[PDB]
Structure formats: structure tokens, C-alpha cells
Design a protein around this ligand. Sequence first.
Ligand code: SN4
Ligand code: CL
Ligand code: CL
Ligand code: CL
Ligand code: CL
Ligand code: CL
Ligand code: CL
Ligand code: MG
Length: 348
Amino acid sequence: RPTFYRQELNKTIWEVPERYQNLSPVGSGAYGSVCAAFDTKTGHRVAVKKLSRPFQSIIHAKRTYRELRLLKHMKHENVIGLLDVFTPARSLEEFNDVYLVTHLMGADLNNIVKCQKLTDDHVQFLIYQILRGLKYIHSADIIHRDLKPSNLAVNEDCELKILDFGLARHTDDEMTGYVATRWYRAPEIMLNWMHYNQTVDIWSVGCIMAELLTGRTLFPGTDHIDQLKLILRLVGTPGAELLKKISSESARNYIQSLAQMPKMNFANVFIGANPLAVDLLEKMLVLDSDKRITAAQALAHAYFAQYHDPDDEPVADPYDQSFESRDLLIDEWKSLTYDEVISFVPPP
Ligand SMILES: COc1ccc(C(N)=S)cn1
Ligand SMILES: [Cl-]
Ligand SMILES: [Cl-]
Ligand SMILES: [Cl-]
Ligand SMILES: [Cl-]
Ligand SMILES: [Cl-]
Ligand SMILES: [Cl-]
Ligand SMILES: [Mg+2]
């Protein structure tokens, strides 16, 4: 057990191993209560997150366990990973606080590229890395559900990592109005058309790629209905085959009140773009999720010819999430979390 020291940060007392020095608050709080630090064991600048009231309710205790399980599993160059996890507690009986350590991420795609169009070679490399990480995530049967520019960390060498695992589900209010937390969502999850699956993430990648190419949000709706109208103008109204699959009778009835529209010509929407980029966007932005291209298929598309290497696009170890359908008491979720803290093995 390392020696811990204490100091006052973010309105509370933090207690951390000596290896972590020069702690200072960072960020806007989107991922939790976080400080930057220097890790003397590894030489990295790191982010240290102190969980707020991790075991105050059944919902919060299970969410803490979920975040730790997801972060311990992710081991890929284009996905956030766990450098360390610790508690000052010496036993389960005194366990109360959890701290997580990751690489410090300076900039995201949003704060870097807002209102700006990038060159085609840059778009190729950035979207390639998103898809490489997504192939890994989906191979573990994990659905991200919230891919958007603020969840993509990028460094000076245009290297990219996917963020946002195991945090609270987004609320109805967070999704209301003229807000970026809805602009990248697939229509079937935005409107609860049907039981969704991992194909929702490919819709989000299409929205991101379009925005890197034009410098503009693809579907900046002022509310759910305005956004649906923008989507259907581009990709066309649903045909009878997809209407069948909308298991919400009320949603199905609203869609049929709208006048029918054909799919638009994407070469006239994305004027001047690489024809291979136009072709890939047409295969991502398909209304029927059954027919969208997958991450593994998209890596082999000719748009990525200068980066694609099928021997360097790895998949994940199996991920057991049977706990997600399990009902337990607060102290049982807390005991499971403690076991996962003390069993952590740091990366090589
Ligand atoms: C220590 O910094 C952290 C910890 C966890 C997470 C996520 N759950 S994505 C993000 N930042
Ligand atoms: Cl230490
Ligand atoms: Cl990482
Ligand atoms: Cl503790
Ligand atoms: Cl964003
Ligand atoms: Cl969500
Ligand atoms: Cl597992
Ligand atoms: Mg999110």
C-alpha cells in the first residue's frame, strides 16, 4: 500500500498516493470532479477523478460499478483507458471513496474545429480512427450512444481517443431544444421508434464526418420534430418496409402524416467533396438501421485506402455485462466495486 497525503480540492479533501503531485482542478465538470496531476511513476500528465457520493443509492452504487467495469475493460489506442484506480480505505468496512486515473486530455474535436472545415486528408485520418475504436467497442457488444465532437479527444499529431463511458444516462431536459446533445442521435433512438442496437453509433459517425467536411452541423434542429424534418429532407421519408419495423404505433402514425419526399443527391449537398467521401456518407446515413454499413465494413471502404491495415485493427476480449440485469442491494454493489478496485493490474 502506498503512502497517501491529503489536500483541499474542489470543495473537499482529496487523499491520494504520493506518486501524484501538483494537483490542480481542470475541466468544466462534464466527466466528474477532476484534477490534473503529474504522475512521477510513469512521467505522464494525468487526470484524477474523485467520485461524488458513489454509494448513496442503489442507482448510484450500480452506476459506480458500471463505470469501473467499463474503464477496466477498454484497452485500445483509440479509446480512453484506465491508468490506475485507488481508495485510501484499508478495508471494505471503511471503503467510501473511489478515485480513477486516466491520461490528461487537453483538446477535443469541438473546441478545436468549431465553425471550420478541414482538408480531406485530415478528415480521412480522424474518421478512420473513430471507426477503428468503434470496431473494438462494438466487438465487445458495447453501444456508445453519445458520439459527438466534444467526446473525441485529439492531440497535436491528430491522434484521437473516444471518451464517455459509464456516466449517467442523458435526461429528457438535456435533450430539449437547440442542443448539441441531440444533433448527432440516430432518429430511431431520438424518437423511441424501436429497440435500438449498435447501428445507432454509425449514424453519429456520419453526422460527425459531414461536419468535418463542411464546417457546419448537419442536422441542427431546434427541437425533436424540427430535427426529424431536417433528416427526412436529406435521406427521404420511410418506405413501407421500415414503417413495419417501427413498433411504436403512435410514432408510426405520426410519420405517415408527413408528405413523402425522395432522398436527395448527396453530391449536390456536399459540393466539392471527394467522391469517395460522398459514397461513404450515403452508406452511413441510411434511415433503416438494418441497412447501414458497419464499422468493420467501413474500415475497408476505399476512402481509407492510405490508412487501412486489417492486421492492425484489433477486436476486444469478451465483456460480461450480465450484471446489468441483476438486482442487488447497495452494500452488494459496493462489495463488487471494492473487489474490482483491489484486483486492478496497471498496464505494461
Ligand atoms: C479520470 O478521468 C476520467 C475518469 C473516467 C472517465 C469516463 N468515465 S469517460 C473520464 N475521465
Ligand atoms: Cl506513491
Ligand atoms: Cl488512454
Ligand atoms: Cl475511502
Ligand atoms: Cl459536441
Ligand atoms: Cl444516453
Ligand atoms: Cl468480462
Ligand atoms: Mg454523454
